[PDB]
Design an enzyme around this catalytic site. Sequence first.
Site, PDB file in Angstrom:
ATOM      1  N   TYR A  45       0.739  -1.273   0.020  1.00 34.70           N
ATOM      2  CA  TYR A  45      -0.041  -0.064   0.038  1.00 34.70           C
ATOM      3  C   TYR A  45       0.777   1.232   0.028  1.00 34.70           C
ATOM      4  O   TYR A  45       2.123   1.166   0.351  1.00 34.70           O
ATOM      5  CB  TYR A  45      -0.940   0.189   1.468  1.00 34.70           C
ATOM      6  CG  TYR A  45      -0.276   0.352   2.717  1.00 34.70           C
ATOM      7  CD1 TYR A  45      -0.305   1.680   2.921  1.00 34.70           C
ATOM      8  CD2 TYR A  45       0.367  -0.634   3.269  1.00 34.70           C
ATOM      9  CE1 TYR A  45       0.481   2.165   4.077  1.00 34.70           C
ATOM     10  CE2 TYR A  45       1.098  -0.304   4.210  1.00 34.70           C
ATOM     11  CZ  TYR A  45       1.077   1.117   4.919  1.00 34.70           C
ATOM     12  OH  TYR A  45       1.691   1.333   6.016  1.00 34.70           O
ATOM     13  N   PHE A  55       3.110  10.725   4.377  1.00 32.00           N
ATOM     14  CA  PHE A  55       3.031   9.739   3.453  1.00 32.00           C
ATOM     15  C   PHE A  55       3.643   8.462   3.922  1.00 32.00           C
ATOM     16  O   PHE A  55       4.822   8.594   4.450  1.00 32.00           O
ATOM     17  CB  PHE A  55       3.922  10.355   2.188  1.00 32.00           C
ATOM     18  CG  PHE A  55       4.031   9.030   1.029  1.00 32.00           C
ATOM     19  CD1 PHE A  55       4.819   8.103   0.886  1.00 32.00           C
ATOM     20  CD2 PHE A  55       2.829   9.280   0.047  1.00 32.00           C
ATOM     21  CE1 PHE A  55       4.872   7.229  -0.130  1.00 32.00           C
ATOM     22  CE2 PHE A  55       2.806   8.379  -0.966  1.00 32.00           C
ATOM     23  CZ  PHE A  55       3.839   7.314  -1.137  1.00 32.00           C
ATOM     24  N   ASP A  56       3.205   7.286   3.739  1.00 31.64           N
ATOM     25  CA  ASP A  56       3.627   6.032   4.195  1.00 31.64           C
ATOM     26  C   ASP A  56       3.351   5.000   3.054  1.00 31.64           C
ATOM     27  O   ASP A  56       2.539   4.998   2.271  1.00 31.64           O
ATOM     28  CB  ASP A  56       2.687   5.648   5.208  1.00 31.64           C
ATOM     29  CG  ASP A  56       3.021   4.332   5.698  1.00 31.64           C
ATOM     30  OD1 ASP A  56       4.057   3.784   6.031  1.00 31.64           O
ATOM     31  OD2 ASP A  56       1.990   3.707   6.355  1.00 31.64           O
ATOM     32  N   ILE A  75      -7.529   0.213  10.758  1.00 34.85           N
ATOM     33  CA  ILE A  75      -8.723   1.187  10.526  1.00 34.85           C
ATOM     34  C   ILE A  75      -9.874   0.669  10.003  1.00 34.85           C
ATOM     35  O   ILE A  75      -9.808  -0.217   9.161  1.00 34.85           O
ATOM     36  CB  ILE A  75      -8.450   2.630   9.978  1.00 34.85           C
ATOM     37  CG1 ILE A  75      -7.742   2.658   8.482  1.00 34.85           C
ATOM     38  CG2 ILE A  75      -7.374   3.292  10.838  1.00 34.85           C
ATOM     39  CD1 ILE A  75      -7.629   3.843   7.703  1.00 34.85           C
ATOM     40  N   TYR A 101      -9.249   7.581  12.015  1.00 37.57           N
ATOM     41  CA  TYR A 101      -8.965   8.026  13.564  1.00 37.57           C
ATOM     42  C   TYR A 101      -9.735   9.203  14.133  1.00 37.57           C
ATOM     43  O   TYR A 101      -9.381   9.554  15.230  1.00 37.57           O
ATOM     44  CB  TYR A 101      -7.377   8.505  13.323  1.00 37.57           C
ATOM     45  CG  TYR A 101      -6.484   7.407  12.831  1.00 37.57           C
ATOM     46  CD1 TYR A 101      -5.696   6.516  13.803  1.00 37.57           C
ATOM     47  CD2 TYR A 101      -6.078   7.278  11.613  1.00 37.57           C
ATOM     48  CE1 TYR A 101      -5.093   5.570  13.194  1.00 37.57           C
ATOM     49  CE2 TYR A 101      -5.283   6.368  11.041  1.00 37.57           C
ATOM     50  CZ  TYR A 101      -4.799   5.588  12.149  1.00 37.57           C
ATOM     51  OH  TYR A 101      -3.859   4.312  11.428  1.00 37.57           O
ATOM     52  N   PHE A 118      -5.529   6.219   0.273  1.00 37.28           N
ATOM     53  CA  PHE A 118      -4.839   4.774   0.167  1.00 37.28           C
ATOM     54  C   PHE A 118      -4.792   4.278  -1.167  1.00 37.28           C
ATOM     55  O   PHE A 118      -5.991   4.236  -1.820  1.00 37.28           O
ATOM     56  CB  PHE A 118      -5.218   3.791   1.030  1.00 37.28           C
ATOM     57  CG  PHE A 118      -4.952   3.912   2.553  1.00 37.28           C
ATOM     58  CD1 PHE A 118      -3.704   3.830   3.160  1.00 37.28           C
ATOM     59  CD2 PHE A 118      -5.952   4.661   3.265  1.00 37.28           C
ATOM     60  CE1 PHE A 118      -3.507   3.983   4.421  1.00 37.28           C
ATOM     61  CE2 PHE A 118      -5.875   4.769   4.826  1.00 37.28           C
ATOM     62  CZ  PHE A 118      -4.575   4.635   5.239  1.00 37.28           C
TER      63      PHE A 118
HETATM   64  C1  LIG Z   1      -1.421   5.577  13.189  1.00 43.33           C
HETATM   65  O1  LIG Z   1      -0.120   4.807  13.300  1.00 43.33           O
HETATM   66  C2  LIG Z   1       0.261   4.703  12.032  1.00 43.33           C
HETATM   67  C3  LIG Z   1      -0.411   4.888  10.629  1.00 43.33           C
HETATM   68  C4  LIG Z   1       0.052   4.557   9.397  1.00 43.33           C
HETATM   69  C5  LIG Z   1      -0.748   4.719   8.090  1.00 43.33           C
HETATM   70  C6  LIG Z   1      -2.282   4.282   8.446  1.00 43.33           C
HETATM   71  O2  LIG Z   1      -3.074   4.756   8.709  1.00 43.33           O
HETATM   72  N1  LIG Z   1      -2.369   2.778   8.587  1.00 43.33           N
HETATM   73  C7  LIG Z   1      -1.381   1.935   8.058  1.00 43.33           C
HETATM   74  C8  LIG Z   1      -1.865   0.842   6.856  1.00 43.33           C
HETATM   75  C9  LIG Z   1      -3.007   0.121   7.225  1.00 43.33           C
HETATM   76  C10 LIG Z   1      -3.757   1.156   7.516  1.00 43.33           C
HETATM   77  C11 LIG Z   1      -3.673   1.984   8.684  1.00 43.33           C
HETATM   78  C12 LIG Z   1      -3.672   1.383  10.083  1.00 43.33           C
HETATM   79  O3  LIG Z   1      -4.521   0.656  10.205  1.00 43.33           O
HETATM   80  N2  LIG Z   1      -2.728   1.527  10.949  1.00 43.33           N
HETATM   81  C13 LIG Z   1      -2.431   0.955  12.176  1.00 43.33           C
HETATM   82  C14 LIG Z   1      -3.664   1.016  12.980  1.00 43.33           C
HETATM   83  N3  LIG Z   1      -4.493   2.108  13.014  1.00 43.33           N
HETATM   84  O4  LIG Z   1      -3.980   0.311  13.817  1.00 43.33           O
HETATM   85  C15 LIG Z   1      -2.641  -0.552  11.914  1.00 43.33           C
HETATM   86  C16 LIG Z   1      -0.909  -0.624  11.546  1.00 43.33           C
HETATM   87  C17 LIG Z   1      -0.108   0.348  11.855  1.00 43.33           C
HETATM   88  C18 LIG Z   1      -1.228   1.164  12.738  1.00 43.33           C
HETATM   89  C19 LIG Z   1      -0.866   6.260   7.909  1.00 43.33           C
HETATM   90  C20 LIG Z   1       0.526   7.064   7.983  1.00 43.33           C
HETATM   91  C21 LIG Z   1       0.391   8.400   7.607  1.00 43.33           C
HETATM   92  C22 LIG Z   1      -0.111   8.414   6.265  1.00 43.33           C
HETATM   93  C23 LIG Z   1      -1.346   7.768   6.317  1.00 43.33           C
HETATM   94  C24 LIG Z   1      -1.465   6.534   6.602  1.00 43.33           C
HETATM   95  C25 LIG Z   1       1.334   3.951   9.371  1.00 43.33           C
HETATM   96  C26 LIG Z   1       2.080   3.868  10.427  1.00 43.33           C
HETATM   97  O5  LIG Z   1       3.433   3.368  10.570  1.00 43.33           O
HETATM   98  C27 LIG Z   1       4.216   3.440   9.424  1.00 43.33           C
HETATM   99  C28 LIG Z   1       1.778   4.204  11.700  1.00 43.33           C
HETATM  100  O6  LIG Z   1       2.455   3.913  13.059  1.00 43.33           O
HETATM  101  C29 LIG Z   1       2.401   2.714  13.523  1.00 43.33           C
END
Ligand SMILES: COc1cc([C@@H](C(=O)N2CCCC[C@H]2C(=O)NC2(C(N)=O)CCCC2)C2CCCCC2)cc(OC)c1OC
Length: 127
Positions: A45, A55-56, A75, A101, A118
């Site tokens: 992704y 960005f990630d 999420i 969030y 995404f």
């Molecule tokens: C809130 O923490 C994070 C969230 C993400 C990304 C994110 O939102 N996710 C990661 C990819 C799966 C979807 C979603 C997600 O569920 N994130 C997590 C959650 N909320 O339980 C599950 C894996 C990381 C935290 C965001 C990073 C900023 C740009 C928009 C996407 C990456 C991350 O680390 C690379 C994060 O830190 C652990």
Amino acid sequence: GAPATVTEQGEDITSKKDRGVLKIVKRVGNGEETPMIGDKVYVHYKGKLSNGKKFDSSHDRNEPFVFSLGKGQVIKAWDIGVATMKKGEICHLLCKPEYAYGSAGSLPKIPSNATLFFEIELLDFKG
Ligand SMILES: COc1cc([C@@H](C(=O)N2CCCC[C@H]2C(=O)NC2(C(N)=O)CCCC2)C2CCCCC2)cc(OC)c1OC
């Protein structure tokens, strides 16, 4: 951009039909099967805040992102969205704060009230 395209042309995939999660298929996957609750799903992704501040990318880590579907390990927008994908599909997802969030956000990456975008490629899944 891609976010605006999804707003215009995206399919609403929420149960409530509140446009909280909008999808456009960018690459069609194989066959008909989609993952079940509890399936181990493997994705690549790219993700960003809609406005662009962060960005990630799993590709930048050289590691597929793995999770169990429909368990709240991700999420809500992902649990909803990934369930709709076929193996090899690539989609774009626009995610309102209520499917991400919400008001709290998450320190330090996600501000309050952030809409997330995404690109997701479903590599494989298994029960
Ligand atoms: C809130 O923490 C994070 C969230 C993400 C990304 C994110 O939102 N996710 C990661 C990819 C799966 C979807 C979603 C997600 O569920 N994130 C997590 C959650 N909320 O339980 C599950 C894996 C990381 C935290 C965001 C990073 C900023 C740009 C928009 C996407 C990456 C991350 O680390 C690379 C994060 O830190 C652990």
